[PDB]
Amino acid sequence: MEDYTKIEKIGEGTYGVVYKGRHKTTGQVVAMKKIRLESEEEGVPSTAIREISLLKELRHPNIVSLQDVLMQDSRLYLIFEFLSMDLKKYLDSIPPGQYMDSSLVKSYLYQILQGIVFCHSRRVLHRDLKPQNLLIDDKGTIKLADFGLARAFGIVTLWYRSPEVLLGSARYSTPVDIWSIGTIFAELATKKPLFHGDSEIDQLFRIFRALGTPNNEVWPEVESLQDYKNTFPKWKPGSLASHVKNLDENGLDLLSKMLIYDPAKRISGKMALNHPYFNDLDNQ
Amino acid sequence: QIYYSDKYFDEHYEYRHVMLPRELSKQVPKTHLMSEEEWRRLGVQQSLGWVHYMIHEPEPHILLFRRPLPK
Ligand SMILES: Cc1ncc(-c2ccnc(Nc3ccc(S(C)(=O)=O)cc3)n2)n1C(C)C
């Protein structure tokens, strides 16, 4: 549309190029995601523009509001509030020796859970959550970006992925986002990724080495999954607190509940918000 | 080039995975584990007695190895 002016590139997302821009009427600064639309078969209607319009109606202070949607010349433009920093970048600005302020960790996790509960209550998953998708303003508010874009289209990524998905489960649901928030919680505290694997298989082995190799005793039906093996290495459960620092006993309890193997037994977003860890929560 | 992981261990075995380039991966059997003679023909170089113990099907280029600890 003629209403906006590109300033500069900010990056590449999975789905297309992302620019910083200004609205000519309001003067507001925006993020503009360009997407080249794939050619489609005649007599097969597209869900993609329909599903994207639905996401425009999601409003919540801790998600990145999709302000508009344009279509010029078989290209789709998504317009968002511009935020100039993400969590990956914020963690990089902290020098060696320093750690993230204990109260700001709590605040951020609270905000993240608020946003994920909002999405989950409206039947919407992220599926692909990670520090690059968590944006921050200068005033210390944090928001999810790219919620529901995965479903709308598709048919560092690995570290935040859940064991359901890695072992090849037929189906998955809201618990995948909770596992990811788990691994991000640990990173906020320590500055470094909890499960720093070099491949799918190495990612599993790092999860096993910290939480125990799963069997049917701790995770019903796991031994039936497509990529389970009786030959995996065999580490015993326990010693999560040796992999993480700067968390009181509540923090460690919540974290361990976000990282339960069985999706059915894993903590929900609602329940996590009522956990004791948040009792002493702070201004901002 | 071929990349060799650091070692990790169990109560019973020691372990180590090896990542081959993707053009060699079409040469690794999609049906059976490999003899020490077989994996040396792909240019995997390490000490005697490592055993090819499993295949993660999504990553056929990753050879997983295992050797029993002595008692
Ligand atoms: C994939 C996607 N679609 C829409 C956005 C999006 C939405 C709103 N604001 C921003 N701003 C932004 C993000 C990261 C960085 S940086 C260079 O510090 O990494 C700099 C500015 N971006 N995004 C993001 C997640 C790229």
Residue numbers in the entry:
A (entry chain A): 1 to 155, 165 to 293
B (entry chain B): 5 to 75
Question: What do the paper's sentences say?
Answer:
Members of the cyclin-dependent protein kinase (CDK) family have diverse cellular roles that include regulation of the cell cycle and transcription and, in certain cell types, differentiation (Lim and Kaldis, 2013, Malumbres, 2014, Morgan, 2007). CDKs share a conserved protein kinase domain that comprises a smaller N-terminal lobe linked through a hinge to a larger C-terminal fold (Endicott et al., 2012). All CDKs require binding to a cognate cyclin partner to remould the kinase fold from an inactive conformation to one capable of phospho-transfer. We have used biophysical measurements and X-ray crystallography to investigate the ATP-competitive inhibitor binding properties of cyclin-free and cyclin-bound CDK1 and CDK2.
Crystals of the CDK1-Cks2 complex were grown in the presence of each inhibitor. However, only two of the resolved structures contained unambiguous density for bound inhibitor. AZD5438 binds ∼170-fold more tightly to cyclin-free CDK2 than to CDK1 as determined by ITC measurements. Through its pyrimidine core this inhibitor makes two NH and carbonyl L83 main-chain hydrogen bonds, while the aromatic core is held in place by interactions with CDK1 F80, L135, and A31. The phenylmethylsulfone moiety forms a potential hydrogen bond with K89 through the sulfone, while the phenyl ring sits up against I10 and is stabilized via an intramolecular interaction with the isopropyl group of the alkylated imidazole. These interactions are conserved in the cyclin-free CDK2-AZD5438 complex, and, again, the two structures superimpose very well (global superposition RMSD = 1.043 Å). However, a plausible hypothesis is that cyclin binding reduces the overall entropy of CDK1 and pre-arranges the CDK1 active site to make optimal interactions with the ligand that results in greater affinity toward small-molecule inhibitors. The relatively minor differences between the crystal structures of cyclin-free CDK1 and CDK2 bound to AZD5438 and Dinaciclib are hard to reconcile with the large differences in affinity observed in our biophysical studies. Overall, the number of inter-lobe contacts in cyclin-free CDK1 (104 contacts shorter than 4.0 Å) is the smallest of any state evaluated here, and compares with a count of 141 for cyclin-free CDK2.
